[PDB]
Amino acid sequence: PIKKIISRSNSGIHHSTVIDYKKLLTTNKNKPEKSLLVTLKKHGGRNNQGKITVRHQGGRNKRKYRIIDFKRTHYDNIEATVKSIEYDPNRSCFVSLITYANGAKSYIISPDGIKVGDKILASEHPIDIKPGFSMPLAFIPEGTQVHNIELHPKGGGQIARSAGSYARILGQDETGKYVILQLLSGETRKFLKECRATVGVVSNLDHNLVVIGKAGRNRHRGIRPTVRGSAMNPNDHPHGGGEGRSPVGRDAPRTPWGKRHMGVKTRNMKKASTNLIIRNRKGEQ
Template sequence: MSCLARSFQKLSLNNIVNVQTIFLRNKAKYVEKPTPGIGIAYRRKVHFPDQYTVKPLEVTNLGGRDPESGRIVVKGIGGGIKQKYHWIDWKRIGPKEGPPVVAKVVKIIKDGCRTSHVALIAYEDQLKYILATENMKPGDIIKTSCHIPRIPVRPNEGDAYPLGALPIGTQVHAVEKYPGVGGFLVHAAGSYATILRRTENKHIVIMTPSKKEFSLPQECMCTVGKLSNADHINTPIGSAQKNRELGNRPRSGWWQRKTGRFGRKIRKPPPVRVFSGPKPEAAEEVSLTVDRPFAKTLRAHFHY
């Protein structure tokens, strides 16, 4: 009887295992597909070290795929020549009082991962990369200061000052969105923002290349000048092979450019967008409740 019971037990266990394997094999794995256009790039992934360095960083080409799930998110990306990434130091930190920090431009190089050129600068015993301006060349001296004087300064190309320290009409780039977060606006080659006016709440209104106006705190840092490689937008690709080297896959032959025969829609720019700082945390609401209803009497007061 014991041998018979043991054989029936093995038979039942084998049947259960086979049923489970068949069920798991046919079960579909649900993977949430990310949405493009929310600040995540699916062209390349840069391997940043723990500390800042001027050594070119390694890059993994994603080809339009999500790095976690491996699913294609953006079509039209793939191939391309392998490029090294130069880590840009977006924060230009200077003294709030006293003379500015002086740095020297060592060299200007091309970066395959961005459109504008990159400048290697040296100050004291440190090296770092910044975005190069249009007329910047090796040997130039640039200044950085966080002081806002009563009279606007007269800056040179490559100098970094707060928006409140510059005169109206100055061309700037790498503008901070909030004080201390680093250059956030205007990074493309040949682009610049213009300082338009000052407001009563110590804000500076600038106009970006897209004709949008932003009202930013006067303490936000920016770099003076127009970005380099202005002919980037006017340089034709020339051939399909060159487009593949840039990392773009061929598109469908059915796509045709709009000829503009019926004109274009002319829309007015959006209103000025004010950046006053990060939103404060909502205060905790305290609600008082009464268990018994109000009882109105003939007298001039209420009983609870």
Template sequence: MGKRTRSQRRGSSPKNRVSSHRFPAANRLPRVSEKMAKVTDLVHSAAHTAPLARIKFEDGEIAHIAAPEGISVGQELAFGDKVRLRPGNVTKLSSIPEGTQICNIEARPGDGGKFARSGGNSGTLETRMGDKVRIRMPSGALKDLPANCRATIGVLGGHGRTEKPLMKAGAAHYRAKARGKPYPTVSGVAMNPVDHPHGGGNHQAVHGPNSVSRNAPPGQKVGHIAPSRTGRGRTRES
């Protein structure tokens, strides 16, 4: 009987949780319609790769959204179905022209944003298809979303964050700590058999299949979890 894996140990200890003070606010699109808001501050969040914009609505409500490039303190943002194509404005996908760059895109209407939320990322509205809209994601993949999902106009701020080298291990340690990630990490194939399902052997390799079921227990749930396909991709012959 082996030891518990790293994922099992992390799940039972409160020391692996992110400190609450590292989250100034949640990055979610507020559930409002046909309202105007004013940017009162741009907030740095150690747990986010893009800055957050603190906005205040006309009725005094305060919210935080991911700040696109080009917005500034004092700028007014519009929320609704008919807004100008200006960075920071939030509207439905059905109201956005084709070819527009958008960020913080909702997967389902009202969920607050799920896609293109990392610093410097953006998606592009490709085409409309009735009650669906096709979006090109930052990865280049195409995704069909409901037309009444919302998105923020513009490219998310924080571009170029990966261009500056970390220089020393301490910088990598604090960057991982801000997100509640383990650092440094050891690959499973470098461990002993009692420490990880991929461990052991005369060379570092996964000996056997590395695909596991979605319902696998925590000690076994490592590798490719319920993959849609495995193996080397094949190109079609013309």
């Protein structure tokens, strides 16, 4: 669901829309709930040394990142109680405040299919294949969507965990290990057959079309104003300035350094799970 934004301004227009955030996120009157709170320090795109590392990213307000438990292994044999679907100022996905009945709470991802109140179990057990649940891929046959899944032992749920992400199961290898998962973006991996699985695409499937309209929404969303390569300084940029702006050259436009990124294979192959790869949209592994 979306909602129109009529600016009612005398100069200019706005066809911008925004997700209502009242039927998909709780506590619209945001007051910091002091149960799982974490203060966030940031440098404005700068680093621990101090110098910047990510240009065109800054000018954002404070965030209170919820303590998300991607492992779903802290408390087992007792199903959790989804207290609320909370906002996440660091992720497009909506966090979920679950509370196991033993006396502890945590934050997880609740994908599309379950909402506040559902009793979800965390274990390596052959538990029911439902959204929010977590179980090994061995109990799930081929032809199912999977998300919020890691590659490395206890490395935390990292891969394919955003809205609309899925992992098509297409059986296992000839060796009986490293089940093949077709992840998002048309890539494919040889996932370990022992890894857990949070089945179901993440909720808010309508989070696909939006008009930012005004810069404040854009600048507070990480993406700062992007400057065109035309009309720059001719210093530090080989095409800026001068009368009669020059068309962009340097076929397959490079980044403004000695490196190249346009169309070239710029994959990293030195990790602890690079042998579990199948396809990366251009080649093999």
